[PDB]
Write a structure and sequence with these properties.
Radius of gyration: 13 Å
Largest sheet: 6 strands, antiparallel
Number of domains: 1
Subcellular location: Nucleus
Order of helices and strands: EEHHHEEEE
Function: Putative transcription factor involved in the generation of biological rhythms. Activates cycling transcription of Period (PER) and Timeless (TIM) by binding to the E-box (5'-CACGTG-3') present in their promoters.
Helix content: 10-25%
Domain PAS: 2-58
Structural class: alpha+beta
Protein name: Protein cycle
Oligomer: monomer
Number of helices: 3
Domain PAC: 63-103
């Protein structure tokens, strides 16, 4: 129930106005960091496979429900819909949109 956007490699570029209440981080704390800084140890391998798919195919990918580390170093459960958009003249990823649903 918050939107974020990331670079092709997973770096946070944007969090919406609802995100800080969920995850605790202010934008200045999280923008510029990799999403790999936050995933739980037990979910990171599966999430990397979802990310690989996002980068390869131009369709939406829905992750498993995973644990995300909040500013207080506890975890919350999220499920994310990810989709990448590529510049048609360079093939590089402009951004990935993420719709992050909270449990």
């Amino acid at each position: 129930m918050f939107i974020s956007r990331h670079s092709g490699e997973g770096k946070f570029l944007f969090i919406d106005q609802r995100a800080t209440l969920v995850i605790g981080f202010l934008p200045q704390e999280i923008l510029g960091t990799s999403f790999y800084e936050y995933f739980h140890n037990e979910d990171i391998a599966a999430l990397m496979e979802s990310h690989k798919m996002v980068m390869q195919v131009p369709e939406k990918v829905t992750t498993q429900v995973y644990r995300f580390r909040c500013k207080d170093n506890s975890y919350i459960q999220l499920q994310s819909e990810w989709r990448a958009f590529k510049n048609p003249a360079t093939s590089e990823i402009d951004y990935i949109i993420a719709k992050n649903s909270v449990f």
